[PDB]
Paper text:
In the present work, we identified deoxycytidine kinase (dCK) as the target responsible for the sensitisation of various cancer cell lines to gemcitabine, using reverse-proteomics. dCK is a key enzyme in the nucleoside salvage pathway and recycles bases and nucleosides originating from the degradation of RNA and DNA to achieve the biosynthesis of deoxyribonucleotides, which are required for DNA replication and repair. This cytosolic nucleoside kinase catalyses the 5′-phosphorylation of 2′-deoxycytosine (2′dC), 2′-deoxyadenosine (2′dA) and 2′-deoxyguanosine (2′dG). dCK is also responsible for the initial phosphorylation of numerous anticancer and antiviral nucleoside analogues. dCK adds the first phosphoryl group to nucleosides analogues and is usually the rate-limiting enzyme of the overall process of converting nucleosides to their deoxynucleoside triphosphate form. Hence, dCK is clinically important because of its relationship to both drug resistance and sensitivity. Previous work has revealed that dCK can adopt several distinct conformations, which are a function of the nature of the nucleoside and nucleotide bound.
The designation ‘open’ or ‘closed’ relates to the compactness of the nucleoside binding site. The hypothesis for the functionality of the ‘open’ conformation is that such conformation assists in the initial nucleoside binding and the release of the monophosphate product. Moreover, it should be noted that masitinib and imatinib were able to open dCK in situ, since we were able to obtain these 3D structures in the ‘open’ conformation by soaking the protein kinase inhibitors in a ‘closed’ dCK crystal. The binding of these compounds also released the monophosphorylated substrate (2′-deoxycytidine-5′-monophosphate), observed in the ‘closed’ dCK crystal and still present in the other nucleoside binding site subunit, elucidating at the same time its mechanism of action.
Numbering used by the authors:
A (entry chain B): 20 to 64, 78 to 260
B (entry chain A): 20 to 67, 77 to 260
Amino acid sequence: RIKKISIEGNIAAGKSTFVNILKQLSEDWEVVPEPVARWSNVQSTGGNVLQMMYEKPERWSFTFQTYACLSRIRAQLASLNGKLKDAEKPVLFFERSVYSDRYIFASNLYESECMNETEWTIYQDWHDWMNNQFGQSLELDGIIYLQATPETCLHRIYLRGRNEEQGIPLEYLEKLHYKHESWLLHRTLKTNFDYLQEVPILTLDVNEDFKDKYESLVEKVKEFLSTL
Amino acid sequence: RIKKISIEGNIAAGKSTFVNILKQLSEDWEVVPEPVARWSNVQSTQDENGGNVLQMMYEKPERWSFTFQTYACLSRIRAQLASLNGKLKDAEKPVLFFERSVYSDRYIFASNLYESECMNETEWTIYQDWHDWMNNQFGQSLELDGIIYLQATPETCLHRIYLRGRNEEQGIPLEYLEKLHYKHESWLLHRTLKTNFDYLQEVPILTLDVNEDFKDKYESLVEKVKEFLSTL
Ligand SMILES: O=c1ccn([C@@H]2O[C@H](COP(=O)(O)OP(=O)(O)O)[C@@H](O)[C@H]2O)c(=O)[nH]1
Ligand SMILES: O=c1ccn([C@@H]2O[C@H](COP(=O)(O)OP(=O)(O)O)[C@@H](O)[C@H]2O)c(=O)[nH]1
Ligand SMILES: O=c1ccn([C@H]2C[C@H](O)[C@@H](COP(=O)(O)O)O2)c(=O)[nH]1
Ligand SMILES: O=c1ccn([C@H]2C[C@H](O)[C@@H](COP(=O)(O)O)O2)c(=O)[nH]1
Ligand SMILES: [Mg+2]
Ligand SMILES: [Mg+2]
């Protein structure tokens, strides 16, 4: 019975950065980071299935997207049962969606011919099902679109220095950025999950370095939150 | 209220052949076959010609062992779960026969493919958690009440595989069948296969020797089933 909100955007736009700005001096706010740490070592509930994916996508992209998405829905679900339901005015923020996996990233790869048509049918059969009983409660109350041009994104992918993702072309980020605008701005993107069409969208321009200029966005979120 | 019973055995032992003799036998009896149909042609799940993932897994197992086993298990979990909600729930002595359980998927077919090196370490690591957590979530509904093992020599299975005519599996070596036979015997007969799900060790099994052609001489066996069920 908490306000579940997704912090969405591109590769190193600054999601995890703002997620940690929000984790701070907000007792009624706790964040759920995408398991990009647990995708790096694949062990018992290591091996790098993200690097394997980035390396031979026309091979591991499917195995990966499946593990990636499962790890999300596992962590997301588990967070609420525990944590702090008792607090009076709670908000739980999710680094990425279960939807962004299927509709922006896994779709992207399929189109980029990394996912065999039959790999795509399976992924979808799987996803449309995982989010029925497990992603039942786990439904969204709002999405925060951290907008950043693919241009800055690329500099900030290096600025990070994550080696698996250093061989990323602007053209890739560019093709992602378009799936984003199509989903969260223009809203031309059509999903199987029909409630998602109506839910709110706070667009924030994170092109301008917000590391020590966070105080404005946080006001604009506190606003967006009063709404829901 | 619904008794759940697994019909287990090696490839082409006579699971469906046996399960259809019992489906006819009573009104309070119903079967849940394995979705080999949706594996042969992978479709978009529509209600009011897709690839063959089983053929893919066969011709190049290095590549489709994991992909198939995941789909295979999902489709099973999906199908089974569906049967319980069906209209036959209100009856006196209603049983359910399942063509293979979610345990044979992992502990026989998936594990062997990992032993045969077709599926890599991290491919295996992923499978297991997935199968664990997924199965554990909403687990109570699917617990078996008993298992029926249809015992046939790997050579009988090779004959029945040929008797069937499944193009894709017409290349299955004796050794493959021989390997799977050992994993069934280990689990369902010698009862030495340790599985994560602990309830299993306490479920009653009924082993039958389908080495002789039962399409005709089924009378003896059924009566055994009937009495095995009276003791559940
Ligand atoms: O105001 C900011 C926010 C982020 N970053 C850089 O952006 C990356 C962090 O982005 P993050 O991983 O948080 O975003 P996500 O990957 O979740 O999109 C790193 O390179 C940071 O140094 C930056 O330089 N200034
Ligand atoms: O006593 C028997 C049992 C089976 N079969 C044939 O053997 C093949 C494999 O049987 P089935 O599909 O039932 O085996 P399963 O794969 O279900 O264990 C089929 O063509 C059956 O008609 C047969 O001729 N006689
Ligand atoms: O559905 C997803 C989600 C994430 N990623 C990868 C992209 C990034 O390299 C890595 C971490 O995400 P960012 O925080 O860098 O966006 O996750 C995918 O490939 N597919
Ligand atoms: O978990 C499974 C289940 C089935 N099969 C294969 C073996 C058979 O060729 C076919 C199913 O038919 P029978 O098991 O009914 O023979 O799928 C597997 O490899 N793994
Ligand atoms: Mg990240
Ligand atoms: Mg069969």
